Inverse folding.
């Protein structure tokens, strides 16, 4: 059973890269150079404080 | 016959082998069939059974009898039973369910197949005699009149028919040796005949009679099959720890 | 004395504090690798047969343990540093049962390219063979084999997954090369992969460059642990 | 040109195969004919160089 | 030792055979032990098991290593496992629990016995490698440094000690053939090595060192035993339907 999918194509606009201006309140898709391909962030402790950038 | 196929033919299936028959058999049993209980009283070693190998039906010989040699009493096959040892020179071969072991015992079943035409007449009589080779009147009991009184099956050549002869184990040991123990004097410890439980007799009950035509077959083949219901082996040795001597044929 | 056996331990200290393999770093470190490593080089016009139609350009034998390394001066990635992780990982095991993922890059062409997979073809080669110098009746596209036709105008990297189709219990890796059995030709490799060009039109003067990268799959497994064969240090490749 | 049977043509469309095979023997005889045949299945053999009834 | 008799010695009993040991073993298992389930998917014929014959412990070889030939890495025995075929000329013999059948499979157990004096020192390392004969780096993995990473048992000569190496069935078939199928080209259907599951390695971990005395023994014998936990046979043929070729030795 190889059913046909005659579902209308969707008009899509191609662009080279994601926003260069956006710095917060959004997601930035990228090719993470890691072995784990999920949402990955550096491990921390009390030895390594939060960013002090208020 | 009466179908696009032939008639429906009966079947007999054992381990790894199937035999086909088309007509009604002619059967009989050598003696009262039983369950061996004094055999465990002869060997301290655990017995072994090989159902997949011993229950198999095997074809060992096929003899041809023609009209010119078919006379009342003509012995078609006269061999010591059970002895089915076949090798390139006259020399038990490990090529089949056969074991090079010291002692063994089992019940046997003999099936005789003959395939004649609708236009021939004759009779074969397959009999068996427990340790007949050891009787002082052996050569005297080969005549069909004597075979009729022994356990036996009859084959009609005027009908295509099969036959089975059940031969339960009977012996004086009660474990017969597969090979020889040759170191003994004639006065004490005489040489022991390996696997000699009896003599299988097939003979001509009624001379094979054919049509007088030239293009008609004057020879008929008699094929035989043998099987073992339950086999036990209690002598474990090297295949060449003891050796097999040339079978001493005993004909009259 | 099992492979891991400590008869009398003299441990002066406590154990080191447990990390998870992903805590002071953020990835879980175990022996599974879908990291893609190279497999071949480039092709020119003078390599292909006189009638290059439905004739493959490359005959790629499929081995989990990679191909037989061959050092060249044109290709230093094989010479100064040995083959990638995958063939050194498979060197400590005996059997595999999974399929392989192949990523293939064709750069000197803007014309359509095909890739076909031959599972039952005996893998008796340890090196890829190109064009004219390919054995006849090979590098001929077959009809009823798993394949994928791709245009280089749309995308010039082909990603396919080669299945495991062997009539056996396992798949043998680290197979010897030259003189047989029935386990070295039908039970070792996943088969052969044929790469050809849809057209018979001549190859551009500059030639074409085919780089084949591959990785392991999920249904793949390194079943029996064997001893590690003696290795060679890449750091001593200058003296 | 080979007149292949259904099992053979299909099998030529697939790489590997397995299962029992059913060989039907049809005889052009009448009630008068009589015989017995011993058809065997020898595993691991592909010729009759060492093949005999016994 | 300390009794009118010697010390109490441990015993290991299988079918029709008993092995005696006096000290603590050194053991290991080749791979994860299991129960074969895809073997019934390879043969339509019923499998056969012969516990009384296959469970037996057999002695096949005894090698002597002297001080003069005892060097680090010295291979005392390097043979393809499992191959225990012994005959008068270089030619599987039916003299023991060995069958001339097409296919078979089983798990193996190897016991190494060494009997040294209270005054010698040395180390033997008995290892096994699944289908090592088919690896492109076979001859390269014979060095004891490589044997340490394979499933293996260690023998100390400074203590009298036995060792057992459990080797569960692992293969690509999953039924290995006992005899050859020789009709094939080198390109397709290459000749199949009968019963080649791997290579059994024993070697010198530490050179055999004896006393400097003249009347002291300078040679020590290393005897080996092999056994099968559960064996299955699914290829029934004539003992001479296929034949046994001369074992192709493969040494480095």
């Amino acid at each position: 059973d190889n059913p046909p999918d005659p579902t209308p194509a969707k008009f899509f606009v191609p662009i080279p890269s994601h926003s260069w201006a956006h710095g917060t309140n959004t997601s930035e898709p990228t090719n993470t150079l890691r072995l784990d391909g999920g949402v990955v962030g550096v491990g921390r402790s009390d030895d390594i404080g939060t960013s002090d950038t208020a | 016959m009466d179908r696009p196929e032939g008639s429906e033919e009966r079947t007999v299936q054992t381990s790894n082998v199937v035999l086909g028959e088309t007509n009604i058999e002619s059967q009989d049993i050598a003696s009262k069939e039983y369950s061996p209980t004094w055999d465990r009283l002869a060997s301290s070693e655990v017995s072994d059974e090989y159902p997949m190998l011993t229950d198999r039906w095997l074809f060992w010989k096929s003899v041809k009898w023609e009209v010119n040699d078919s006379a009342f009493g003509k012995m078609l096959v006269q061999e010591k039973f059970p002895q089915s040892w076949v090798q390139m020179d006259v020399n038990i071969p490990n090529f089949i369910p056969f074991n090079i072991h010291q002692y063994m015992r089992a019940d046997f079943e003999v099936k005789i197949y003959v395939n004649p035409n609708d236009f021939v007449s004759g009779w074969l009589i397959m009999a068996f005699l427990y340790q007949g080779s050891e009787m002082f009147d052996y050569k005297l009991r080969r005549n069909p009149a004597a075979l009729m009184q022994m356990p036996h099956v009859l084959v009609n050549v005027g009908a295509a028919n099969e036959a089975t002869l059940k031969i339960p184990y009977r012996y004086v040991r009660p474990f017969m040796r597969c090979k020889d123990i040759l170191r003994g004097d004639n006065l004490i410890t005489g040489v022991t005949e390996p696997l000699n439980m009896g003599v299988l007799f097939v003979e001509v009950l009624i001379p094979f009679r054919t049509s007088a035509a030239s293009s008609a077959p004057k020879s008929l083949d008699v094929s035989l099959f043998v099987k073992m219901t339950n086999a036990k082996f209690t002598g474990m040795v090297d295949g060449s720890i003891a050796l097999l001597s040339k079978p001493i044929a005993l004909p009259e | 004395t099992p492979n891991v056996m400590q008869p009398t331990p003299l441990l002066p200290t406590t154990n080191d504090g447990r990390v998870t393999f992903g805590e002071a770093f953020n990835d879980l470190k175990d022996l599974a690798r879908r990291y893609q490593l190279y497999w071949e080089g480039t092709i020119l016009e003078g390599n292909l047969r006189a009638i290059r139609r439905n004739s493959a350009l490359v005959q790629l034998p499929l081995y989990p343990h990679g191909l037989r390394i061959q050092p060249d001066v044109n290709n230093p990635i094989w010479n100064i540093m040995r083959d990638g992780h995958i063939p050194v990982i498979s060197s400590g095991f005996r059997y595999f049962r999974g399929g392989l993922r192949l990523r293939i890059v064709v750069e000197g062409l803007n014309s359509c390219v095909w890739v076909q997979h031959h599972p039952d073809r005996p893998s008796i080669f340890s090196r890829p063979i190109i064009g004219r110098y390919i054995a006849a009746k090979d590098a001929y596209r077959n009809h009823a084999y798993a394949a994928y036709v791709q245009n280089m105008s749309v995308n010039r990297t082909i990603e396919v997954e080669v299945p495991f189709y062997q009539p056996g219990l396992y798949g043998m890796l680290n197979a010897s090369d030259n003189n047989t059995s029935f386990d070295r030709l039908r039970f070792t490799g996943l088969g052969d992969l044929l790469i050809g060009i849809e057209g018979e039109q001549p190859i551009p003067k500059e030639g074409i460059e085919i780089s084949v990268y591959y990785s392991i799959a999920d249904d793949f497994s390194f079943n029996i642990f064997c001893g590690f064969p003696p290795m060679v240090y890449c750091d001593e490749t200058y003296s | 040109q080979y007149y292949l049977p259904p099992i053979s043509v299909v099998s030529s469309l697939y790489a590997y195969t397995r299962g029992s095979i059913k060989y039907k023997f049809l005889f052009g005889n009448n009630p008068r004919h009589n015989a017995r045949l011993l058809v065997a299945y020898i595993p691991g053999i592909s010729s009759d160089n060492r093949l005999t009834l016994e």
